[PDB]
Ligand binder design. Sequence first.
Ligand SMILES: Cc1ccc(Nc2nccc(-c3c(-c4ccc(F)cc4)ncn3C3CCNCC3)n2)cc1C
Length: 127
Amino acid sequence: SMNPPPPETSNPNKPKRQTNQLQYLLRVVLKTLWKHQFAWPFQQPVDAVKLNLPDYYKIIKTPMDMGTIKKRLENNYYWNAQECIQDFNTMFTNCYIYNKPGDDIVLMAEALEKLFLQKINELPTEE
Ligand SMILES: Cc1ccc(Nc2nccc(-c3c(-c4ccc(F)cc4)ncn3C3CCNCC3)n2)cc1C
């Protein structure tokens, strides 16, 4: 099986805006997570072909990854910070759904998720 197309990261029909919360998500949250020692499996769409995971996109029907999230932020694709936060949550829950408790990739996701939650606890009030 081929990989599916990646999620949309640009739509010229969508209205755009900048908010201090979206700037924080890009400049602080995504930066902090990207540099984490466990980030690398999460920095791009899951390449099921390359990794020989025939069942990944049979099980995961709402794919998400931090590469996609970053592109969405850089493209001003998100209107609301909540959209971005949901995409992070989708990413982590996909990892948990595909794998099993205690799997190394799951422990890696948990660590990134704990860090994510800590950073979004510091999200500035909407300016
Ligand atoms: C030792 C090793 C070698 C290569 C990789 N690379 C890699 N890249 C993208 C995906 C996954 C992956 C995911 C996954 C990752 C992100 C996500 F959002 C949802 C699911 N869930 C499982 N996997 C692999 C399945 C085969 N065994 C390695 C993990 N692994 C990782 C590790 C630990």
